[PDB]
Amino acid sequence: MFYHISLEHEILLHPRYFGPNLLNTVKQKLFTEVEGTCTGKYGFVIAVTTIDNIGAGVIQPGRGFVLYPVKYKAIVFRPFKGEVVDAVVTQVNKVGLFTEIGPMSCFISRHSIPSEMEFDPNSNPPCYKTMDEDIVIQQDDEIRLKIVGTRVDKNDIFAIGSLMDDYLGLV
Amino acid sequence: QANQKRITTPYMTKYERARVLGTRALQIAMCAPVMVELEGETDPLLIAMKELKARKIPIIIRRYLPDGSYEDWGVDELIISD
Amino acid sequence: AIKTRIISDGLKYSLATGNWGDQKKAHQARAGVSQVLNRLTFASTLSHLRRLNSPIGRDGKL
Amino acid sequence: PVPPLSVRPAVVMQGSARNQDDLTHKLADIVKINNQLRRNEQNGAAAHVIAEDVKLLQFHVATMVDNELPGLPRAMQKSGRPLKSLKQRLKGKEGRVRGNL
Amino acid sequence: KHMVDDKIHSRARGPIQILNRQPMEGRSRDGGLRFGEMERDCQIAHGAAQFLRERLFEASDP
Amino acid sequence: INGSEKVLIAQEKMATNTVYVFAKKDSKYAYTGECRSCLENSSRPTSTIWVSMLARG
DNA sequence: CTAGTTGATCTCATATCAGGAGAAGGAGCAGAGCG
DNA sequence: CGCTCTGCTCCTTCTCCCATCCTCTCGATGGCTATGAGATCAACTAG
RNA sequence: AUCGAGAGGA
């Protein structure tokens, strides 16, 4: 889910960067640090929106560094259990179906999908089709899903979705 | 605390001078820009003392009060005695 | 029946360590007896051989 | 709580004989009597036997944390030297607080 | 007997004790000199907090 | 002993079989007469006997 | 695929004197209310 | 009028503490705590 | 190497 949240961080700065331009260096270091990063508690951060406040930089005794506490508005993405989201299909396989929701790629097993949608490896595009062959779920398709599970690995979140619930089908 | 009325002494204490000079000397030793001109000085302590005499050390002393508040003094705002 | 190690090892231990007493009672025993002879100069040797000790305890401040 | 190996390092002598700390010897006594009491409660033992075992376990734990209990016998070791309990490790001068901190 | 060559000693990051990772004791052990309680009190009176932290934290057992 | 030259230091002790009347300032007794008694050929430690006077009041 | 040998790992089973100073508890007890 | 509730004193434990740093030597320290049969299993070493 | 003890220095 797209959101706009204020977050807090503290970053050390070497004495070389004091210079005639200092606030800009802390700004860009914050950007290079938490741009594209990911956390399991606040979800993935798409980007940092605007830097609100730059606290007083405290010189650590015994160390030349200075730590600046920064408050910044950034937009996060957090998937949820029971949430319904439209996704884009990317791969069809006999083990399951892979669809990308923004930066995450979620896999749906045939067990969770209703039994109507058959496997069809003989088709030129690997695709899922029913007895009537009316609905067609193949690569690059746009399909609705319900996110049931979330898992974080190496601070990177990967979700799992279901197509069983009613009205969840091809767009 | 009202910065318009700071109750602490306008003088730099001997301990403030000691720690400010040491801190700034470490900063210079770690390739921080120097605020004063330099004839041939290469020792960070000498450069830090020259900056203090010139009143050009970019450090703020946060003096804590017993009640918990604090007062921020620029090194250029304090009276350097020694 | 005579295990001669009692007398031998007892006298040897007591003179070797200075702990004057049975080896088992190594804390009830009083040390400082039987010191290593000082051989740094002839006067030190003579004086060490003519040395007396008042076992009042160095901790005592009387 | 049995401390880690850092608190009671097993120092190797000139050869291969690994000498254990006083704490480790005391914990050995504690585990011995604890297992002994566990079996004596689990299998056939008289009430007075279990009482004596509990008394000895109490003595071992107390002398592990504090060896100079007045009246009681000092926890002994080889060579007739009393063990250095956790209290003597930091009791006064040459303890942790005054001697190492 | 007291010659200076048997007394002079210096240390800079030598061996450390096993139990507490602090410098050894003695010239023979290449040990460090004790910065004792009275030295701590003297440096507290001086007001030298970073030197006190260097001696009691960073030069002993970080 | 083991190649090490060891010297026995003479140890001072109060003489035995002699009556010594002392007076401890901080004690229940005003005067105490002690006698560390020991048989001629020693076989046991010195058996000290005290004969004291209780302090007045 | 098929046995077979070989380590490692783990379970099981066999037996009979010249301290001092202060703080806490306890006990003896004198005494005051008072039921 | 006999019980209770003090609360004072004397004694008794009981427990804590006793300068700093430094050098050297000398003696003790050991601690050792088995064995093997069976089953399991997983890896080669052949087939 | 540890521990203890002893002898010493200021």
Helix (H) or strand (E) holding D35: helix D22-42
Count of domains forming chain A: 2
User: Is the CB of residue C36 inside 7 Å of nucleic acid strand G?
Assistant: no
Stated as kind and residue range, the H or E segment containing C46 is: helix C42-49
Q: Are E50 and E38 in contact (CB under 8 A)?
A: no
What lies within 8 Å, CB to CB, of A2 at 6+ separation is A46, A75, A77
Facing residues of F35 across strands?
Answer: F49
- Give the CA distances from residue A27 to residues A9, A31, A55, A64, A76, in Å, rounded to whole numbers and listed in that order: 12, 6, 12, 19, 19
Provide the shortest C-alpha distance from residue D85 to chain E (in Å). Answer: 15
C-alpha–C-alpha distance, residues E1 and C43, integer Å? 14
Check whether residue A96 and residue A43 sit in a common domain. Answer: no
Instruction: Give the closest residue to A116 by CA, choosing from A90, A100, A136.
Output: A136
DSSP state of D78: G
Q: Rounded CA gap, A137 and A96, in Å?
A: 12
Selected residue of F8, F12, F13, F24 to mutate for chain C interface (largest C Cβ count, 10 A)? F8
Q: In whole angstroms, what is the distance from residue A130 CA to residue F21 CA? A: 120
Task: Report how many domains make up chain B.
Answer: 1
Q: How would you class B55 by CB atoms within 10 Å of its CB: exposed for 0-12, middle for 13-18, buried for 19 or more?
A: middle
Q: Which two tokens stand for residue B68?
A: 């918990």
How many whole angstroms separate alpha carbon D58 and alpha carbon A165? Answer: 65
Task: Give the residue on E whose Cα is nearest the Cα of A61.
Answer: E50
Give the 3-state secondary structure of residue C24: coil
Query: Would you state the structure tokens that stand for residue F43, as one six-digit string?
Result: 């076989």
Query: Is the Cβ pair A61, E50 closer than 8 Å?
Result: yes
- Say if residue F52 is exposed, middle or buried (CB neighbours under 10 Å; 0-12, 13-18, 19+): middle
Amino acid B14 reads: K
Closest alpha carbon to D37 in D26, D20, D49: D49
Contacts of D29 (CB under 8 A, 6+ apart): D60, D75
If asked whether residues A63 and A101 sit together in one domain, one would say no
In chain D, residues with a C-beta closer than 8 Å to the C-beta of C27 are 80-82
d(CA B26, CA B45): 8
- Phi, psi values for residue A28, rounded to 5°: -70, -35
A156 CB-near residues (< 8 Å, 6+ apart): A38, A44
Structural contact between residues E44 and E52, judged by C-beta atoms closer than 8 angstroms: yes
Choose among C40, F57, E47: nearest CA to B17.
E47
Backbone angles phi, psi at B7, to 5 degrees: -85, -15
Of A19, A52, A80, the one marking the end of a domain is A80
Residue with tokens 């507290």: E44
Distance between start and end Cα atoms, chain C: 51
Distance C10 CA to H35 C1' (A): 39
Q: What would the two tokens of residue C55 be?
A: 């076992």
Distance A10 CA to G1 C1' (A): 63
Q: Among positive and negative, which fits the CA dihedral A79, A81, A85, A87?
A: positive
Contacts of A116 (CB under 8 A, 6+ apart): A130, A131
If DSSP codes are grouped into helix, strand and coil, which group holds residue E30? coil
CB-based burial label for D34 (10 Å; 0-12, 13-18, 19+): middle
SS3 A27: helix
Q: Which residue type does F56 have?
A: R
What is the Cα–Cα distance from E15 to E21, expressed in whole angstroms? 9
Cβ within 8 Å of residue F39, ≥6 positions away: none
Cβ(A143)–Cβ(A89) below 8 Å: yes
Q: Does D9 touch chain E (CB under 8 A)?
A: yes
Q: Are A88 and A112 in the same domain?
A: yes
CA distance F7 to chain C (A): 5
Furthest-apart CA atoms within chain F: distance in Å: 62
Residue C51: what are its φ and ψ, rounded to 5°? -90, 135
Are residues A71 and A90 both part of a single domain? no
**B14/E47 CB distance under 8 A:** yes
- Tell whether residue D93 is among the known ligand binding residues: yes
Same domain membership, residue A120 and residue A105: yes
* Same structural domain, A4 and A88: no
Residues D25 and D64: their CA atoms lie apart, in Å, by 10
User: What is the distance between the terminal CA atoms of chain D, rounded to a whole angstrom?
Assistant: 24
The reply to whether A147 and A101 lie within a common domain is yes
Do A67 and A108 have their domain in common?
A: no
E1 three-class SS: coil
Residue type, E10: S
Q: Do A112 and A139 meet the contact criterion of CB atoms below 8 Å apart?
A: no
Do A161 and A99 fall into the same domain? yes
What range defines the domain where residue B81 resides? 1-82
Q: How far apart are CA A24 and CA F18, in angstroms?
A: 97
Instruction: Compute CA A101 distance to the chain's CA centroid, rounded to the nearest angstrom.
Output: 8
- DSSP category for residue C48: H
Strand G interface, F 1-57, C-beta < 7 A: 13-14, 22, 24, 26
Question: Within 10 A of C30 (CB to CB), how many other CB atoms are there?
Answer: 11
Give Cα B75 to chain centroid, integer Å.
Answer: 4
A54 and A122 Cβ atoms separated by less than 8 Å: no
E10 close to A (CB below 8 A) = no
Resolution of this structure in Å: 2.7
Query: Does residue C53 approach strand G to less than 7 Å at its CB?
Result: no
Question: Is residue C53 helix, strand or coil?
Answer: strand
Contact call for residues F34 and F19 (beta carbons, < 8 A): yes
Which helix (H) or strand (E) covers residue A39, if one does? strand A38-39
Domain end: A46, A80, A114, which one?
A: A80
CA closest to E57 among chain A residues: A62
Residue by residue, DSSP assigns chain B as --TTS--S-SBPPHHHHHHHHHHHHHHHHTTPPPSS--SS---HHHHHHHHHHHT----EEEEEPTTS-EEEEETTTSBP--
Task: List the beta bridge partners of residue A39.
Answer: A43
Give the residue numbers spanning the domain of A119. Answer: 81-171
| A26 and A67 both lie in a single domain | yes
Q: Which helix (H) or strand (E) holds C10?
A: helix C5-17
Pick out residues 3-32 of chain C having their CB under 7 A from any atom of nucleic acid strand H.
12-13, 16-17
Please identify which residue in the block is written with the tokens 């749906």.
Answer: A108
